[PDB]
From Swiss-Prot, chain A:
Protein name from the UniProt record: Small ribosomal subunit protein eS31
Native source species: Oryctolagus cuniculus
Post-translational modification: Monoubiquitinated at Lys-25 and Lys-31 by RNF25 in response to ribosome collisions (ribosome stalling): ubiquitination promotes subsequent activation of RNF14, leading to EEF1A1 ubiquitination and degradation and rescue of stalled ribosomes. Deubiquitination at Lys-31 by USP16 is required for maturation of the 40S ribosomal complex.
Stretches annotated zinc finger (C4-type): 39-62
N6-acetyllysine modifications at: K22, K31
Quaternary structure and interacting proteins, as annotated: Part of the 40S ribosomal subunit. Part of the small subunit (SSU) processome, composed of more than 70 proteins and the RNA chaperone small nucleolar RNA (snoRNA) U3.
Coiled-coil region(s): none
UniProtKB/Swiss-Prot annotation, chain B:
Biological process (GO), any one: translation
Span of the signal peptide: none
Keywords for the protein's UniProt record, in alphabetical order: Acetylation, Cytoplasm, Nucleus, Ribonucleoprotein, Ribosomal protein
Record-linked InterPro entries: Ribosomal_eL30-like_sf, Ribosomal_eL8/eL30/eS12/Gad45, Ribosomal_eS12, Ribosomal_eS12_CS
Molecular functions (GO terms): structural constituent of ribosome
Similarity comment: Belongs to the eukaryotic ribosomal protein eS12 family.
Subunit structure: Part of the small subunit (SSU) processome, composed of more than 70 proteins and the RNA chaperone small nucleolar RNA (snoRNA) U3. Subunit of the 40S ribosomal complex.
GO cellular component: a single term: cytosolic small ribosomal subunit
Biological role: Part of the small subunit (SSU) processome, first precursor of the small eukaryotic ribosomal subunit. During the assembly of the SSU processome in the nucleolus, many ribosome biogenesis factors, an RNA chaperone and ribosomal proteins associate with the nascent pre-rRNA and work in concert to generate RNA folding, modifications, rearrangements and cleavage as well as targeted degradation of pre-ribosomal RNA by the RNA exosome. Subunit of the 40S ribosomal complex.
Name of the protein described by the UniProt record: Small ribosomal subunit protein eS12
Length: 68, 117
């Protein structure tokens, strides 16, 4: 029946089209300008990039953290 | 050599060698698992087609450039509801970087001979 206190807004995914385009920066020559740091873990090697946070750095797979 | 692509692509789908998609292309080319790199073309891609070019032209990775995205998508076997007839509507896949463990094939050498020159 009728409850007073309003319901909780559910999480909607912030889908970002071509998220690989942000991870890298393609060069004029056959090379790279990789902006993001790669996770220096054992579980994930050179494949997984770290997160570019505004007061830290965080890996999304193995949950590794590096701070300023 | 198009029916060669059909066999190698299906011996990588079945046995699950391919790291399909550009995020997983970037995975297979950072780990360097690419025994091949297939590419579809003629899509409004200013930066995306240069990404795959500079990644493939980094060290050793080959390049198959087929024309149509929907055509590669219809080969890579994504959407066929009512198989008796035609595929209904399939998304246009671009980068299916095969790491073909299933070299139990006629089609491995004929593509490797098409890359020999």
């Amino acid at each position: 029946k009728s409850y007073t206190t309003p319901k909780k807004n559910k999480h909607k995914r912030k889908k970002v089209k071509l998220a690989v385009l942000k991870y890298y920066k393609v060069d004029e020559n056959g090379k790279i300008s990789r902006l993001r740091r790669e996770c220096p873990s054992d579980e994930c090697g050179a494949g997984v990039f770290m997160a570019s946070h505004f007061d830290r750095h965080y890996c999304g797979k193995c949950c590794l953290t590096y701070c300023f | 050599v198009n029916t060669a692509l059909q066999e190698v692509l299906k011996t990588a789908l079945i046995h699950d060698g391919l790291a399909r998609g550009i995020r997983e292309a970037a995975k297979a080319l950072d780990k360097r698992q690419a025994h091949l790199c297939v590419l579809a073309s003629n899509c409004d891609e200013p930066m995306y087609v240069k990404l795959v070019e500079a990644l493939c032209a980094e060290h050793q990775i080959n390049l198959i450039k087929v024309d149509d995205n929907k055509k590669l998508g219809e080969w890579v076997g994504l959407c066929k509801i009512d198989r008796e007839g035609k595929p209904r509507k399939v998304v246009g896949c671009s980068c299916v970087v095969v790491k073909d463990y299933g070299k139990e094939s006629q089609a491995k050498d004929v593509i490797e001979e098409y890359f020999k020159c």
